[PDB]
Structures are given as C-alpha cells and as structure tokens.
C-alpha cells in the first residue's frame, strides 16, 4: 500500500554538448510518466495509462507551470553564483518535490533543493518553515518569510498532490500491479585459480528483488557481490550478482531469485542451466 510521487528538477550551466540545460521528470512508485526538457519546452506523457486518463488541457497547464519553473531556475543559477562569488563553470540547481501515501494512511510530503550536489533548503511541515542548511541559503529563507509561500506549499503537499496520487494509482493499477518474470542465466569465468560464478536476471518488474548465491543448499550472502538493481530502456529492471569459488565446485553453487512474479523462489544452476 506504499505509494509514492516525485517531481525531480535539474538546472545546469554545462549540460554540455547537445544536451538540454533544464530537465523535469515525474515519477509514480518509481516509474517515469512525466517528461520535460529545455530544448522542446513541453510536458509530455511517457506511459499509456496516464495519457488515456488525461486530456491535453491538463498537459498544457502542466507545461506553462514547468516553463515558469524553467525561468525561475534560470535566474537561480545566477543569484546563487553571486552569494558564493563564482564566475562560472560546473554549477547545478536540484529540486525534488512530492508526497508519499503510507500503508497506514499518513501523508509524508517533501520539498527540498540542492546547489552543486549539496543540501541547500528543505521545507518542514511540523514547523511550517523553510530550513536553511548552508549559510548562503539564509537570503532564500528571507524571501520565503516575506512572501509567505509556506501555507500555500503545505496545502499542496498534503492535499493537491495527495488527491492526484490516489487517482494516478487507480489510473495505472493494471500497469503497476502487473508482474514480469525474469530471464535468469548462470555463468562462470576462470582467472587466477579462482572461478567467478555470475548470475544475471533479465527484464523483471517490480523493482524489489533478492538475488542470493547458495553453496550446498546454504545461502552465502557475505561471499556474493551485487551490482544493484539497474534499469532497462523499456521500463524493466536488471541485476548482476557474482561469487568467488574453487575450480571444480561450480555445480555445487545455486542462484536463488525471489521475485513477486515467482510464487516460490527460483533456484538456478550452471549445468541446469539457468532459467531455460
């Protein structure tokens, strides 16, 4: 029942070649649905469930507010460079806003910024004030206390996004709820008297997966090294786990893959061999 919404923004000085300087990306449970760039200057859908449940009037209203966000982040790069006293080079302005609907039903809304990959300003709901993490983020707090954006932002993070996220979950209930089975392949490589056994899971959904190596039926979590849950170009995910072994012990090892698509954890060997 844990459903998330996140709108990530990036304003750049050096994109660099061909790439756009401004980019706004939206997410529903970690999946891309909203796309924007400074070259095209249009908020367009990415998933089939969002486009089939929204009109062009919604996307036209979403474009103009992000176009305004583009211009606001354009001057932000120039304003922040004066406070730090910098001529130019590699400078970036990051922003991540959204709300989380927890299992119990508690609303967890976040709104925070960063300059040069370091925490700048973060909004708190319990205090209803914008917290400044860096001494150069103090004039930002002065602008927020004068304007009074605090009440308007709180009614957005607790109501506006929360009401829309409930609809987004219902719009893509068939897409998010769908489970994709992974294609498992068990490999091995010989180097300096050490056999490195590899296990790769191809195109699985959702993102959570536990891929562990086994020796004689017993799990060996410490000896196994994972590469992480890396994403594919179509929306699916990939994972790579390797373990060191004695040459001639390869078949004693088994790859355990426990995913939402599998009712029981899948056990795959090199000679079996793998998923096929």
């Amino acid at each position: 029942e844990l459903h998330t919404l996140r709108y990530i923004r990036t304003a750049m000085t050096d994109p660099g070649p061909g790439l756009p300087w401004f980019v706004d990306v939206g997410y529903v449970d970690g999946e891309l649905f909203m796309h924007y760039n400074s070259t095209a200057r249009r908020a367009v859908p990415r998933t089939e469930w969002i486009a089939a449940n929204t009109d062009q009037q919604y996307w036209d209203r979403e474009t103009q507010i992000v176009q305004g966000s583009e211009q606001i982040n354009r001057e932000n790069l120039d304003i922040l460079r004066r406070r730090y006293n910098q001529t130019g080079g590699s400078h970036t302005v990051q922003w991540m806003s959204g709300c989380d609907i927890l299992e119990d039903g508690t609303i967890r809304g976040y709104h925070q910024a960063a300059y040069d990959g370091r925490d700048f300003v973060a909004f708190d709901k319990g205090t209803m004030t914008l917290t400044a993490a860096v001494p150069e983020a103090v004039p930002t707090k002065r602008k927020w206390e004068e304007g009074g954006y605090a009440e308007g932002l709180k009614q957005y993070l607790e109501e506006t996004c929360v009401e829309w996220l409930r609809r987004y979950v219902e719009y893509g209930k068939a897409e998010l709820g769908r489970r994709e089975r992974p294609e498992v392949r068990v490999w091995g490589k010989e180097a300096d008297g050490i056999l490195t056994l590899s296990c790769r899971a191809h195109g699985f959904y959702p993102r959570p997966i536990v891929v562990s190596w086994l020796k004689d039926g017993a799990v060996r979590g410490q000896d196994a090294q994972s590469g992480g849950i890396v994403p594919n170009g179509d929306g699916t995910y990939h994972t790579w786990v390797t373990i060191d072994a004695q040459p001639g012990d390869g078949d004693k090892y088994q790859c355990r893959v426990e995913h939402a698509s599998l009712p029981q954890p899948g056990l795959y060997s090199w000679r079996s061999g793998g998923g096929l």
Partner: peptide, 10 residues
C-alpha cells in the same frame, strides 16, 4: 501534479 513556479525560487 506540480504546484506554483514560485516554490522553486531561491
């Protein structure tokens, strides 16, 4: 849905 452009001002 994203709110007002003013919340991104620094």
């Amino acid at each position: 849905t994203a709110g007002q452009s003013n919340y991104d001002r620094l």
